[PDB]
Each structure stands twice: as structure tokens, then as C-alpha cells.
Amino acid sequence: MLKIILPSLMLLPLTWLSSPKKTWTNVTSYSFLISLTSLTLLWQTDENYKNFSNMFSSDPLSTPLIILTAWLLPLMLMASQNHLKKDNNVLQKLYISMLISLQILLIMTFSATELIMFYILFEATLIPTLIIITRWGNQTERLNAGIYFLFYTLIGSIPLLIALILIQNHVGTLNLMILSFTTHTLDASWSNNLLWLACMMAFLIKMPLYGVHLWLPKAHVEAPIAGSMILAAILLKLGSYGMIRISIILDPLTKYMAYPFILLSLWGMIMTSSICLRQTDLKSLIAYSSVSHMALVIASIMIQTPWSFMGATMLMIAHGLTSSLLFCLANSNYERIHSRTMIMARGLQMVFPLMATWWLMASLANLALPPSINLMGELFITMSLFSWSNFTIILMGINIIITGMYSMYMIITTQRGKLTNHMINLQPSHTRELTLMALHMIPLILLTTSPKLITGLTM
């Protein structure tokens, strides 16, 4: 893991020592090489786990998240290097440093073998995205969004720290494999119920669970494009990864303690899909779609079925890719028309045909068109939920119907229809942003071609 961590660390001196006319080129190229290096974690020819060191290890669950982070860093640089052209050189290098630090800390968080180090890197990732949102956001409400994000996460994560220290005192090491082997069954008392809630509520906050999801739409709206990408594509999945890692020592009382959160997830995905149906802001629509998909992931992890875990992993990877792609397309329209209003730009299919093709493919990925990994994850989550209870199919079907409805509504109101001819400032297309859309869509196609990479721990 050190062979990925060290050159990502060396990206920062490269950023601060490169010429201002060469910084973007050098950092983008070497981050692409970093991702190519990170692809060596897929060499898993055995049932064992690649425990590289005493503090770093690789997993069938951790590996796709690490590869996705390393792949998202150059895409974030390409996405963010347009709204920083009228910007100071040291501020540009600081922004690149923030993105690189996010990538480093997220790779270390996913490769961590010890839960206290996982929590330390959790908060370490909490810092620079707050800095990015607050400093390079556009509207006034970025400060309130950053406060909401930071303190939802902190109030979640403090009882997680208390619970981790308690489990460390009880067991001795807080090492993941040691806990997985010497797991003890809890006796289902009120203290154990509170311990369960303490170690689950941080991840449920960052997922986000319904009712506590209020930080996410304003944070994603007010964030810059790279911040929205890293948030919606890695940090929610970081919460899910924490849930999967910590759920192994919570038997058996997760069986009955999972009940309120499954109901919250299902009804919240219905409610947030309805909000997407009636939402006037494109980034808000994408954010609430992310809330619904992560609610599906929450329900799968709560029901703790091998099909549910596999569908959760596939939906994590697929939703990260398609949500970053949707945010990049919305940011292209935002850099064109300087607005986020859903209905303001309408006939963009006429002027931007290839970008309309990218929009259509992103939305078809969003509504889980087969045989994509989006549909793979959603279908296996549905199968596991129907095994858990046959009446969940009603909520699943309503969610699927509204999902297709808001995705096609987005397509029709942003691309189809008559062209808003007053928008004289419609530059044709940037090869940079078309490349960004291609670099989002192609890994979706390749993972659709070979879905065995992102199945996860259970299969």
C-alpha cells in the first residue's frame, strides 16, 4: 500500500515545485499514473486478504474504493481546472493540495486495519472537504453548508470514538482481523444497545440516513465541482464501508436493532425520490438521488445478507461513478449559464449533441438500465430485501418508478424541448469536459463487462 501512498504524498511537492504553466499537466499525469499503480490491488488469486503491513491491508471491499479514489483524483483535477483560471497561482496550488490530501487520506482510510486509525483518518478527511466547500464555494450559504456538514459528522463521530475506545478496552487491540476471529456474542442489554447505536450512528450520519440527511443537499449544492464529486462518490461510501467493518462485532442485537433504520431507509428513499420529482435545483436533485441510493445501501447493510452486501458494494461503486458524472454534466451547464435552475436551460440537445449523449447515458445509468452495475446492485439489494420480508417489494417498486420518473424528467427538461435562444453565451464544448464525461462513462462500461471485481466480501 506504501507504493501507492508514497507517490501520492510526493504529488504535493510536485504541485508546489512545478511551474505555474505546468502544474495542472504534471499533477494530472502523475495522478493518472497513481491510479494505474493502484490497479495492482486487483491481483487477488487466492481467498486470502492482501495484508501488506501491520497497519495496511487490502480487501475485496476496500480495493474498489481505493481504485475509485485514485481514479477520481485526476478527474477532479480536470473538472476543477476551469473555474480556477481567473485565480491566483498559490491558491490554485493550495486547491490541488487539498484534493491530493483528500485522496491520500481516503486511500489510507480504506486501507486501514485498525478502527482508531480509521476514525483518525475519517476526521482527517473531514477537514479538507470543509476547507474546499467553505473557501471555493460560490453562494453565501456555503458557510452554513460547511457548518451543517462538519457538525452533523462530528456529533455522529464522537460516540463512535467512545464506542471504539470501549471495545478496545474490552478486547485489547481493536484490530479488524482479531475482532473478526475472536468476536463475542453480546448479551443484548441496554448498555449493548447504546454501544450499538454509538458505533453505528456516525456511519449512518455520513451515509446519510433519512431525517439526518439535511447536511447533504446544501453541502453538495454549495460545494465546488471537485468537492461534490469527492463527497458523492467517496465519502458516503466511506460511511457504508465503516458500517460493514463495524457490523461484524454487533451480533446478535443488530437483528432487532436494524428495524428503525430499514424503515427510515425505505420511506426516505421514497420521500427523496419524490423531492427529486419536485425539485427546482439540478444539484439538489442529484443530491437527493444520492440520498435515495445510499438509503438502499443502508437497508442492504442492515439486513446483512450476502446478496445484500454484494449489491451494496456494486451500488456503492456504480453510484459513485454515475453521481460524479451527473455532477460534472451539471457543472458544465453551470459554467455555461451561471445558474443551477432546473428549468432555465431547456433545449440543450440542439446545441450540445455529444453532451446530450453523455447526459442520456448518465441518466440511464442512474435509473439502472441493464446490464449495468447500477441495476446489478439495485436488483440484488431488492432480492435480499424481499428475502428479508416479501412486503418490501412495494416500497422498492415505488422507488424504482419514481427513480425512472425523475431521471427522465431531468433529461426532458434539460435536453429536450425548444431551445432557450436567449442564451447567447453557449460555448460549443470543451475537450476537457468531454474527456471528463468519457472518463466517467468508460469505467462503468468496463465494470458492466466484468462485474466480478466489485462483488465484495461475500462473493
Binding site: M55, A112, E114, I116, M117
Partner: protein, 57 residues
Amino acid sequence: GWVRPDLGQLSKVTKVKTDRPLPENPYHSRARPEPNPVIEGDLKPAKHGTRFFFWTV
């Protein structure tokens, strides 16, 4: 035949011979409690480093 002592003679410490035995425990002291069993041995290094959470050394 008595001679008055000079200046400084009555005020000095004199030895004296007696057959009365010296009291071995004049304070009537109880038995003193034993000290702690001090640990001896070579100072080996710390096992597996500091063992502070996830720190290897």
C-alpha cells in the same frame, strides 16, 4: 580537700561506667513493615514497540 571546678569543666560530656544493660528497644517499637519486593533483571526493550493503538513502533 575539695577543689572548685574551673570554667568549662562541669559542662563537658563525660563517659560513665555502669553495669545496667543497654535497652535494645527504648521506644518500644513494633516490627517495621518490610519494603516492596524490588524487581531486578536486565532492561529488555519494549515488546512490539510502544503498543499504543495502531503504532507499530
